[PDB]
Design a protein around this ligand. Structure first.
Ligand code: HEM
Ligand SMILES: COc1ccc(C(=O)O)cc1
Ligand SMILES: [Cl-]
Length: 393
């Protein structure tokens, strides 16, 4: 009663243009079986939203990649928040929520915003730039690692470790094995910067270590929670900002609208997050037999959620393939939904908003003027290179 498909959502051809295959996955049925990896798939907004919001039946403590932690060893000690279920998840989540609080955004906002303006001002002096390396990448590297409290040496390890983390959610294909065999130096730098003496006072990491006397987490838990923010805190944002820029370059009517009202910047980024879904997919594991969209899924089965496909589901979105900076984006799953919904979304939206605001005030046109290149990853969607000519306003 469940349609079996041979689509590999982790193949290179799929990454190259996922969107037809995602329609085929949505239209086959509410639940599909993916024979290549032996997992269930859900690609419609409805079923994705349901799975995300039933963490008792679709837990994350057996991993949220293909590997089931009850069967295989994880490639690194489990995250205390991503790879945990309530109740063990609850208090480490409260710590990271407070570390990344509204009050904390108040303190870095003007710094983040200035750095966005300085970066756009700097790129307008060059004209022809690469909006991935010189912007999408350069901007978050200039404000996140300082906000984390990190030393300066070794920062070249952060994006590679992020790409490793997201590649290791995927199946044991060559992208994953090659990331793991390249991993050791990045693992080593990251784990070391998680120790309390290496985290500059006032930053996010020091704050995490300072939350250890409340009975919410203990001191030996602090290093791993810092690790979370060195894993999840960079590449997505970069991909999300690279997508905004791309969209603004590819849809010049939306750039003309952003310029006319820069207050649209925040929702313009939110729309980029929905349109690109930098995190394309996550897994859950069933803790019990369950009925999902008229199928009966046994205990201990991996379920693949297509988040980017739920964000383009014509059953939920009008013209889902169009980038509309005035769209009501509320409800998209680009950040998840429910108990694990991105705990750092306030940092991402603040980075992306102030970047787009900067562009909206200072740029008249953005024109692709060279070969666009994609970056392949088992979990992340984003560009490798996006040569643009920026035109000062
Ligand atoms: C556009 C940028 C981002 C996107 C698209 C994104 C995507 C996601 C998604 C889909 C989830 C839910 C995972 C799940 O349900 O298993 C998540 C959770 C998480 N994110 Fe983000 N994220 C972004 C930025 C950030 C930032 C800036 C941080 C840190 C500052 C961060 C740290 C985390 C952590 C620690 C979790 C785990 C939360 C939990 O398990 O309860 N992410 N992210
Ligand atoms: C959604 O992406 C991630 C990746 C890693 C972690 C973590 O290491 O906790 C959390 C979220
Ligand atoms: Cl690691």
């Amino acid at each position: 009663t469940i349609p079996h498909l041979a689509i590999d959502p982790f193949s290179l051809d799929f990454f190259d243009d996922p969107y037809p295959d995602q329609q085929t996955l949505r239209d086959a049925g509410p639940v599909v079986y993916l024979d290549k990896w032996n997992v269930y798939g859900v690609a419609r907004y409805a079923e994705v939203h349901a799975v995300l919001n039933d963490p008792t039946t679709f837990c994350s403590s057996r991993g949220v990649g293909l590997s089931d932690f009850k069967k295989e060893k994880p490639w690194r000690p489990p995250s205390l928040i991503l790879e945990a279920d309530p109740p063990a998840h609850t208090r480490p989540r409260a710590v990271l929520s407070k570390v990344l609080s509204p009050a904390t955004m108040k303190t870095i906002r003007d710094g983040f915003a200035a750095a966005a303006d300085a970066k756009v001002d700097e790129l307008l002096q060059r004209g022809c730039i690469d909006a991935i390396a010189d912007l999408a990448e350069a901007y978050p590297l200039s404000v996140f690692p300082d906000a984390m409290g990190l030393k300066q040496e070794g920062r070249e390890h952060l994006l590679p470790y992020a790409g490793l983390v997201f590649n290791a959610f995927g199946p044991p294909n060559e992208l994953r094995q090659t990331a793991i065999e390249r991993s050791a130096p990045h693992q080593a730098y990251v784990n070391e910067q998680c120790q309390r003496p290496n985290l500059a006072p006032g930053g996010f990491g020091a704050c995490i270590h300072a939350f250890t006397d409340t009975g919410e987490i203990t001191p030996d838990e602090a290093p791993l929670l810092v690790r979370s923010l060195l894993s999840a805190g960079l590449q997505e944002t970069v991909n999300g900002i690279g997508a905004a820029v791309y969209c603004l370059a590819r849809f010049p009517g939306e750039l003309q609208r952003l310029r006319s009202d820069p207050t649209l910047a925040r929702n313009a980024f939110e729309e980029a997050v929905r349109f690109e879904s930098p995190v394309q997919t996550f897994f859950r594991t069933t803790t019990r037999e369950v009925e999902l969209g008229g199928a009966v899924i046994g205990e201990g089965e991996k379920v693949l959620m297509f988040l980017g496909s739920a964000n383009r589901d014509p059953r939920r979105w009008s013209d889902p393939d169009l980038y509309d900076i005035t769209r009501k984006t509320s409800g998209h799953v680009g950040f998840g939904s429910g108990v694990h919904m991105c705990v750092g979304q306030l940092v991402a939206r603040l980075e992306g908003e102030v970047m787009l605001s900067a562009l909206a005030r200072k740029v008249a046109a953005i024109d692709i003027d060279g070969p666009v290149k994609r970056r392949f990853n088992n979990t992340l969607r984003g560009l490798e290179s996006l040569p643009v000519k920026l035109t000062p306003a």
